[PDB]
Design a protein around this motif. Structure first.
Motif, PDB file in Angstrom:
ATOM      1  N   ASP A 261      46.423  11.619  72.369  1.00 18.54           N
ATOM      2  CA  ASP A 261      47.859  11.387  72.181  1.00 18.54           C
ATOM      3  C   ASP A 261      48.678  11.465  73.442  1.00 18.54           C
ATOM      4  O   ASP A 261      49.637  10.698  73.571  1.00 18.54           O
ATOM      5  N   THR A 264      47.900   7.894  74.586  1.00 19.08           N
ATOM      6  CA  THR A 264      48.157   6.888  73.539  1.00 19.08           C
ATOM      7  C   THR A 264      49.582   6.814  73.017  1.00 19.08           C
ATOM      8  O   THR A 264      50.022   5.732  72.611  1.00 19.08           O
ATOM      9  N   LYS A 265      50.289   7.951  72.997  1.00 19.99           N
ATOM     10  CA  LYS A 265      51.656   8.032  72.469  1.00 19.99           C
ATOM     11  C   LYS A 265      52.723   8.171  73.562  1.00 19.99           C
ATOM     12  O   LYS A 265      53.914   8.040  73.273  1.00 19.99           O
TER      13      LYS A 265
END
Ligand SMILES: CC[C@@H]1[C@@H]2NN=CN2c2cnc(Nc3ccc(C(=O)NC4CC4)cc3OC)nc2N1C1CCCC1
Length: 281
Positions: A261, A264-265
């Protein structure tokens, strides 16, 4: 002054880029073409002993054919009775250690921006069965384009199975994995651990297990005793926790790190401004 090989080709030594046991580094421009390099000038006397000679030859051997955008390009070497001249890719924006000295901390998108490049570089190395073994800010070279090149193969090694690998304690103490301190040697997981330390240093300002003493740092590494500042994002703390695991097999792979994350985020800028070398972007 000037440097030259067996062909008589001259190179003008520019400014001293840095020292540190036991090489002097200079910007070096070919007198006839103008081609610029970062030259490591190693005195033959400092590498006369077998272990020191083997270290220098291994660096050259492993660095020679490494061709990746996130890896310092080895150009060529030559030697005379006085010195060993190692010509490497000059990165005009110094290293992440230089930026870290100027900045102390980097913003989360900057850390993510550099971590991606470091991970791309390391993945290439790992795929070629080479372990860096000395991953630190000082070894991440920055070009004019703000492109990170993983450099300094002085401690690079052929990735060997656990039973075969050398069990020697080496690598920068603040970045060294617990299994290395435990004389289990370096595996790809030890490079991943050093990256966890890189990430932490860039976000917080100092290496995670930094203390007044080396003995205390080593104890903090072995027990994975470090504080996660409350101000770091949850994905940053989650990724640091997954990476900074005492057991090498419990650590994520580079592919797993990149699917976390935190990456990815999170926002990754396409490029960082040159100004980010000295001040907040
Ligand atoms: C040449 C040795 C390594 C290296 N290894 N592989 C690639 N390397 C390097 C590439 N580019 C650079 N660039 C530079 C580093 C420091 C400086 C700098 O200004 N240093 C100031 C303290 C005098 C400037 C650089 O380029 C203009 N350094 C490298 N370094 C630095 C490590 C410490 C000195 C040079």
């Amino acid at each position: 002054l000037i440097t030259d090989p067996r062909s008589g080709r001259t190179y003008l030594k520019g400014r001293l880029l840095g020292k540190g046991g036991f090489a002097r580094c200079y910007e070096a421009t070919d007198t006839e073409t103008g081609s610029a390099y970062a030259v490591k000038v190693i005195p033959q006397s400092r590498v006369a002993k077998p272990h020191q000679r083997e270290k220098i030859l291994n660096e050259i051997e492993l660095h020679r054919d490494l061709q990746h955008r996130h890896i310092v390009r080895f150009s060529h070497h030559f030697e005379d009775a006085d010195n060993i001249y190692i010509f490497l890719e000059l990165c005009s924006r110094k290293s992440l250690a230089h930026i870290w000295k100027a900045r102390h901390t980097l913003l989360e998108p900057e850390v993510r921006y550099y971590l991606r490049q470091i991970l791309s570089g390391l993945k290439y190395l790992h795929q070629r069965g080479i372990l860096h073994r000395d991953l630190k800010l000082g070894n991440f070279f920055i070009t004019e384009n703000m492109e990170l090149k993983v450099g300094d193969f002085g401690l690079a090694a052929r990735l060997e199975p656990p039973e075969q690998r050398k069990k020697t304690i080496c690598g920068t103490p603040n970045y060294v994995a617990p299994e290395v301190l435990l004389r289990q040697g370096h595996g790809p997981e030890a490079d991943v651990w050093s990256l966890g330390c890189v990430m932490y240093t860039l976000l917080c300002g100092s290496p995670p297990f930094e203390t007044a003493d080396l003995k205390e740092t080593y104890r903090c590494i072995k027990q994975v005793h470090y504080t996660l500042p409350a101000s770091l994002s949850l994905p940053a703390r989650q990724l640091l926790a997954a990476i900074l695991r005492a057991s090498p097999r419990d650590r994520p792979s580079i592919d797993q790190i990149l699917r976390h994350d935190f990456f990815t985020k999170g926002y990754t800028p396409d490029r960082l401004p040159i100004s980010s070398c000295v001040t907040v972007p």
